């Protein structure tokens, strides 16, 4: 058992780094990519709208790839990536 799940491919995480584990494996995504376990185990931007309890707490969280956009919308004082309209 405990085979090389990282050897399967170099882009296993589609960005991060595939790790090895007993009867299983993991990955080390990049920026904000979250293991695309829903598809396999690649890199699929996390839920920036959930990573922070203040994120667009009073605006809009347009979670995007390897990042997220916050909208009060503009005209106010919403943090670019700090999470919290102002």
Q: Which positions touch Ca ion (CB under 5 A)?
A: 2, 20, 45, 48, 63
Report the nearest approach of Ca ion to the CB of residue 81 (Å): 11
Q: Which is closer to Ca ion, CB of 45 or CB of 52?
A: 45
- The CB-of-39 to Ca ion minimum distance in angstroms stands at 15
Is the separation of the CB atoms in 84 and 57 below 8 Å?
yes
CB atoms within 10 A of CB 6: 18
Pick the closer one to Ca ion by CB: 2 or 11.
Answer: 2
Compute the least distance from the CB of residue 72 to Ca ion, in Å.
19
| CB-CB contact of 61 with 67 (8 Å) | no
CA dist., res. 33 & res. 15, Å (int): 8
């Amino acid at each position: 058992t405990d085979i090389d799940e990282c050897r399967i491919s170099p882009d296993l995480c589609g960005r991060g780094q595939c790790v090895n584990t007993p009867g299983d494996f993991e990955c080390k995504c990049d920026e904000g990519y979250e293991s695309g376990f829903m598809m396999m185990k690649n890199c699929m931007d996390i839920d920036e709208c959930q990573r922070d309890p203040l994120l667009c707490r009073g605006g809009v969280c347009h979670n995007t790839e390897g990042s997220y956009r916050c909208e009060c919308p503009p005209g106010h004082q919403l943090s670019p990536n700090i999470s919290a309209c102002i």
